[PDB]
Design a protein around this ligand. Structure first.
Ligand SMILES: O[C@@H]1[C@@H](O)[C@@H](O)OC[C@H]1O
Ligand SMILES: O[C@@H]1[C@@H](O)[C@@H](O)OC[C@H]1O
Ligand SMILES: O[C@@H]1[C@@H](O)[C@H](O)OC[C@H]1O
Ligand SMILES: O[C@@H]1[C@@H](O)[C@H](O)OC[C@H]1O
Ligand code: NA
Ligand code: NA
Ligand code: NA
Ligand code: NA
Ligand code: NA
Ligand code: NA
Lengths: 199, 191
C-alpha cells in the first residue's frame, strides 16, 4: 500500500485547531462535493480521541431558532452531570461562545468565540466544565449538539449572557430574544459552580 | 401533540424501529432531544455510535442504495431528515432470516422529525422527495470502504415499490450494483 510508504498522501477527514483556551477545539470537517450535493463525515470516535476529545456522546439535541437575535446561554450542568458538547450548525449561522467555568482554572471566567455556520460546516468542542452560549445571526438557524452526559434538569444552571465580569463581546446587544430562564440567569459572582480544574 | 419523550414503533420487520421524538415549540423556535442512549437501549437499540455523517441531496429524485457493509464492519444506522423529505428503505439481508430479501419503508421529513433504526445485517436505500434534503446518519461502526457492497435499487427479487415522480438520479456505483442473487452477503440471522 503506497500510503504506508508515505509516497501517496491521503488527507484525514478533519482539521482540529486548538483555540486560545486550548481545551476548546475547532473542528473543520471535509466537504466531499458530488454531482447531487455533498457528504460530510461529522464525527469519528477514533480521530476525535486522537485529539483529546474523550467521553461517550449519550445525548443529541436539535434546536431551531426562527429569528436573528435569538440568544441561548450561558448554560452548563453541575458535576457529576457536566456535558461536553460538540456543536455545529446545519442551516444558518451563530456566534458561538465557550466560557471556562472550572474553579482554580488559570482561565476561569475567560471565553473564546467562533462563527459556526451551514456555509463553513465548522464544529466546536466545548469540554465539560465550560458554559455554552450562542447568538443567532441568520433566520431559521438549526443547531445540533452531541452531549457527553444525558440531560439532568436539576443540574442545569444559567449565567446571564451579558455578565459584566465575563464581558463577552456579543456582535448584537439590542432587540435580543431570550427565554425566561435565560433572561433570569444569575451573575457570575452569585453563580453555583462545582466544576474543578485538573491541569 | 405527543405526550412521551420518544415513541418507539417496531416495523413489520420488527428489528427495524421507527422513532418519533417529542418536539418542544416556543416563540423562539423548537427543541428536540433526538437521541438518548438510556431510552434507546431500553427499546433494543444497542451498540456504540462511532461515526456520524451528513449528506445533502440538492436535487429531488436522487436515489442512493442499496448499501451495506460486510461483517465484521456492518453499520447499524439511525437515519433522520433535518431538512426536506425522503422515502427511506431498510432491506433485511441476514442469511437464514425468515424476512431475508424483504423490505420496509417510511417517509422521513423535517415536518415529522421521525428517525429510522436500521440494524446491522440490513441494507439502506433512500429516494429524495424534496430539493435541498439534508440526511443525518449515526453509524455503529466506523466506515471501512473495502467492506461496502452495492445491490441494484431495482432488484426484482427485493422489488421495492419506489414512489418515483421525477427523473431518477443514480450514481455510477449504484447503476452498477449487483442483483441480490449474485450479491456478496455474510450477515447471519440470530433472532
Ligand atoms: O479571570 C476573571 C475571573 O476571575 C472572573 O472575574 O471572571 C472574569 C475573568 O476575567
Ligand atoms: O422471500 C423472498 C426471498 O426468497 C428472496 O428472493 O428475496 C426476496 C424475498 O421476497
Ligand atoms: O470546506 C472544507 C474546509 O473547511 C477544510 O479546511 O478543508 C476541506 C474542505 O472540504
Ligand atoms: O455510501 C456510504 C454509506 O453506505 C456508509 O454508511 O457511509 C459512507 C458512505 O460513503
Ligand atoms: Na460520557
Ligand atoms: Na452546509
Ligand atoms: Na444532534
Ligand atoms: Na439493537
Ligand atoms: Na455502507
Ligand atoms: Na447525528
Amino acid at each position: 500500500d503506497l500510503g504506508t510508504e508515505n509516497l501517496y498522501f491521503q488527507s484525514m477527514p478533519f482539521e482540529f485547531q486548538k483555540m486560545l483556551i486550548p481545551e476548546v477545539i475547532l473542528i473543520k470537517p471535509k466537504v466531499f462535493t458530488d454531482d447531487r450535493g455533498f457528504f460530510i463525515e461529522t464525527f469519528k470516535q477514533s480521530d476525535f480521541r486522537r485529539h483529546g476529545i474523550n467521553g461517550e456522546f449519550l445525548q443529541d439535541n436539535h434546536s431551531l431558532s426562527m429569528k436573528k437575535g435569538v440568544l441561548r446561554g450561558l448554560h452548563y450542568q453541575l458535576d457529576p452531570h457536566a456535558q461536553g458538547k460538540l456543536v455545529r450548525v446545519v442551516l444558518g449561522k451563530v456566534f458561538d461562545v465557550a466560557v471556562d467555568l472550572r474553579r482554580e482554572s488559570p482561565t476561569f471566567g475567560k471565553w473564546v468565540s467562533t462563527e459556526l455556520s451551514s456555509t463553513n460546516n465548522h464544529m466546536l468542542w466545548i469540554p465539560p466544565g465550560f458554559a455554552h452560549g450562542m447568538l443567532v445571526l441568520e433566520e431559521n438557524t438549526h443547531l445540533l449538539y452531541k452531549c457527553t452526559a444525558e440531560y439532568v434538569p436539576e443540574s442545569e444552571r444559567y449565567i446571564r449572557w451579558d455578565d459584566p465580569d465575563i464581558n463577552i463581546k456579543w456582535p448584537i446587544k439590542n432587540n435580543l430574544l431570550l427565554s425566561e430562564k435565560d433572561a433570569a440567569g444569575v451573575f457570575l459572582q452569585r453563580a453555583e459552580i462545582n466544576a474543578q480544574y485538573h491541569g
